[PDB]
């Protein structure tokens, strides 16, 4: 996923 945002 994304740095801070796993859910992206």
């Given at each position: 996923?994304?740095?801070?945002?796993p859910?992206?």
């Amino acid at each position: 996923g994304c740095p801070x945002d796993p859910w992206c």
